[PDB]
């Protein structure tokens, strides 16, 4: 068996959702921000936001909504986790003591159902009569909000429309009514139903179906003065309400897909709209009052306000202040002005909240020679792309290098006092036949520049027609100085060539240190790339020289230096190249038993291969024979996102389901079959998507640092910006910390009453297993935050083992010391 | 000649790697040195010498040289390790069963989460599986181990049934005592949970119905670790075993012993309301408690869902590709 | 695709055994003894008639490729029965076959099994499988005797007498090389033909074509009387050589 420990070094920073309301008091204006597993509660001021409370939940926050049922003084909070843990929460404050109350809770998972393409949707009736949930295709789940439903019991209503895009409860209806866009073979349509709690079924809806734009994305329930709904698409915005129909199709929005919406005026007069290019619009409802005394919708107008970060959620607060919640870049507070500035913009940034964004890649480097180590991450996407340099100093200090294009891979080259960074920028097919970039960025702002002139694929004869307005990616290798972080050089790769892998190393007997890049020729027609390059660059005297190029028949997904040789994975193949005295790559040996060799790692003559669907394989280079040997494979199938070697026997993997697992050689030489089977001894639901594992630590090492019980250090970066740490334990230390977890879980009160053991259980759509071989260090480190009565309750009847004394009782002061040392690894 | 099996050496294949761990040996991917064809080699280890050549392999050699069907895996030949020269007693070299290499297995594709099935994809998949099963059943052979892992799939959309290690002949006229515990619990029929021991080819049909539902849900339908727990889950959806729906249930050994918590009513049509009507009717008939009322393989092929499916159009599933490695930023 | 398992009578003059100096009479005796050893061992163990026949067919085929002087017959027989049990799903443990083989064989005969009987048998399984070219599925005259008899309608008592007498001749033909000369379908017809002659029955009357005097042609196409007479002659030769007489 294997024993490991996992802690958070940086909590998730990306904003997954945000709502406003009156949650902490019926009087205050609240802003609740949801980061993965984290809920942040703020109070709105005239200066900005006053933080008041933050809680963690044992689940990914999928739904977050505020509502106030009749009889309540203030808003209540509904949250549903991605594992279908539902709960209703209340804020309660007694002087200085703030706590969160679980009013109702339960798990709403169905035994039989197909998870929907557009994900979990949760909405609440305007009269707060019921909670609507769209969890599975063809089913609509209703949790009625009666006071007796403390277990959140619910029923399903058969829904004929299997493929639903979005749904909202409508305002101004005699009965609870849902309006939703759905897709069938005839296109997309908008349709309404009435929801009857008494009959527990749908009844005919207030207005008929209308056919809508093929890419109708979002539904807006317009408030009582207007009523009805607005439908946002790629090209058009339409309003629907019985006999009334409007459509505005301004050319302004066709340029970029609109992803978020918010209501500015409670009466529905004004809405905010944001798009993937960071543009912020105002949607205006022009009123016309008739002599009847009725109010109708006369027309719709869209007005461009300015530019924000690419926002997952918008929420207007008060006055001119808007909170911009960003998942791909830094979040913001911005002020909307009535008068535009001299550039024509109505938007001026107030504050910027650090978001480590998607961490696509990262490396640890001793820039200042401190023996400490700093973490340089490839963070963000598109305009929010950045390099973030992170050091420990009690908070983490983070420096941001704006790139305005997507960073893909990073690798440090000490000889050149610089970093190599792969990046891609979006250009659009223009009337010249070529393409034009939407904005300047790192690859166009380099001091010196170069473009590949390779003739390898120049023969072509394969047609790829271009239509004006289509997007394409342009990939580059950036040379970036380690002190100024100034782009010294940008090399642009071939048209339709993607840069997938990057290493900096010396090869063979060649004393020169090279940047080596593996690429793939990506054409829309192809399912899997069938052409690619391995390119050897030398950065010398401010310019990048092409030293050699090797053509391959696939995508070079991963490369890693192997004892003076170059180890590269091309599609299914894993290949080892030698670097000749003629400065060309020469193939030594191949291994082909893969589906897609996405990831590679090396220790000694051993290789860890990560596959798209076949989990991880352990290869070995046989120098006596000049070839590879298969040592052991993990035959449990998993979809890999990243891998890492912990030691000669233990191997770490990350799943696309937000799970971690550890494989080990079965170390039983009885049969060859036992050795060739990698046994999954560690299983752990992380809750984050791991892109990059990286050996190293951020802690200061003066070497006077006490030797911690934990041995080894692997950092990992995630899509939501979370940075974590994996380290190993002895059997003695694992048992102590595991037994302590079971005690802590009985003592600590969970938000939503979610069982901790459930949360960390390995989870795919198909299976659920109890966690094994992993200590939730974030749980262990919470021992220091529980009250003294609880601490002593935890240590009761707790014994140590395999120590200086075989049996030794623990005190609350003893464990406080142990955990405090465990907090010093990050 | 092509028929003189057991003599050709495994030297004739370049071994690529081990695709899986089997029952009587490890399964290896390999390339034929002469033709270039990719094969899968099932290694047979007789070195144990407990009972010699494993019967599981004998069944697969005996049966798969009889069965010829596009939806039934074909054994190409049997090859051997370099045999010790004229000293058969010391010779402990193994034998390898040569099969056509198939790109994927359904379990691998489903477990990885890298396959999406449309209705038309499910039609092409089910029609091939039922045709393969009908061929086998028409030849009076039982598979007895139908699982997603035993359904191999090429990217073209061709399906083939594979593990015939537990397959045996069925005699209608004469009931024969068989092995009660044959199919894996998740795909095991209710009759065998109660221990019929004299089972019909309908056991294989129930398994294929479980697959039909799993293709629509992407999650296995009846997942339990204990035989009684399985009966409960099946009972909740298909209804509790009772004499009205299964007149002969009272003779089954464990009927009184193994009882569900309640006498649940059948809810299959309600819980699978999202499944198309043509398919839902097939599921109701395939997942019928009474094996004598459970539909046949032929009857599934003469169903509204599958009868008009044309195998010229195989409809490949939406399978693993290159952008599946990259995660979408928006 | 599939191998040829049928030889001509003339070809039996050139088996490995014959060419190592064994005369035709001796090989015939060694085959009867081995077949009957297989029959008796498996009968004591309670084995189905198909299981006995399959082992006997393996045995007969084996010694078309090997010599009786280099492969002791009783070891081969035990090995064939051991494999036959697994092929026909009537498995037995090798130790039980040895136990029964010891009960039925004298001390000299059991000396063939050497110092470790089980090992001598289990080791041979490899050569047996390669020799029979891994073609394990075998059909026997029994199923055709019954398939064809069911299509006869008439006096139940006369037809059952026909079947049992024919069934006995099938059991007796397992000691001969007829298994190596003629497909089982033909054997089943020949034994029906023989029993009819002995019981003075006219089988055509029981067929759907009562005026089709060559009644067997509807069961087995392209079989001349020449063949059925050759087979009948060979079966009755066994009875005449011994002291046993036709069952009647
Ligand atoms: C017995 C274990 C497997 C599990 O799939 N069953 C199986 N899989 C086949 N191919 C699918 C396949 N490609 C793979 C490539 C890799 Cl790298 C890995 Cl790790 C597993 C793989 N699995 C196949 N082809 C002919 N047979 C035949 C029957 C023998 C097959 N049997």
Numbering used by the authors:
A (entry chain A): 1 to 393, 708 to 1140
B (entry chain B): 715 to 1044
C (entry chain C): 20 to 267
The authors write:
Recently, several unexpectedly diverse compounds were reported to deplete cyclin K by linking CDK12–cyclin K to the DDB1–CUL4–RBX1 E3 ligase. Here, to investigate how chemically dissimilar small molecules trigger cyclin K degradation, we evaluated 91 candidate degraders in structural, biophysical and cellular studies and reveal all compounds acquire glue activity via simultaneous CDK12 binding and engagement of DDB1 interfacial residues, in particular Arg928. Crystallographic dissection of 28 ternary complexes demonstrated that despite considerable diversity of the molecular glues, the overall complex architecture is highly similar. The low-affinity DDB1–CDK12 interaction primes the complex, while the ligand, through filling the kinase pocket and bridging over to DDB1, drives robust association, offering a rationale for the unusually broad chemical diversity observed.
We also synthesized six compounds that are hybrids of SR-4835 and CR8 (DS18 (65), DS17 (66), DS19, DS22 (67), DS21 (68) and DS20 (69)), yielding a series bearing all possible combination of the R1-3 substituents. SR-4835, DS17 and DS18 were CDK12 selective, while CR8 and DS19 were not, linking potent pleiotropic CDK inhibition to the co-existence of phenylpyridine and isopropyl substituents on the purine scaffold. Hence, the modification of the gluing moiety from phenylpyridine to dichlorobenzimidazole (CR8 versus DS17, DS19 versus DS18) is sufficient to increase the gluing potency and reduce off-target CDK inhibitory effects of CR8. The ten best-performing degraders were DS73, DS71, DS72, DS17, DS18, SR-4835, WX3, CR8, 21195 and DS28, a list that overlaps remarkably well (8/10) with our in vitro data. Performing the assay at lower protein concentrations for selected compounds revealed subnanomolar dissociation constants for the top derivatives (for example, DS17) but presented experimental challenges with a limited assay window. Notably, the compound’s Tanimoto similarity to CR8 and its in vitro activity show no clear correlation, with the ten best DDB1–CDK12 molecular glues (DS18, 21195, DS72, DS17, DS19, DS25, DS73, SR-4835, CR8 and DS16) ranging from CR8-like (1.0) to distinct (0.33), further supporting that diverse chemistries facilitate the formation of this complex. To better dissect the cellular responses, we examined the extent and depth of cellular CDK12, CDK13 and cyclin K degradation by mass spectrometry using quantitative label-free proteomics on MDA-MB-231 cells treated with representative compounds.
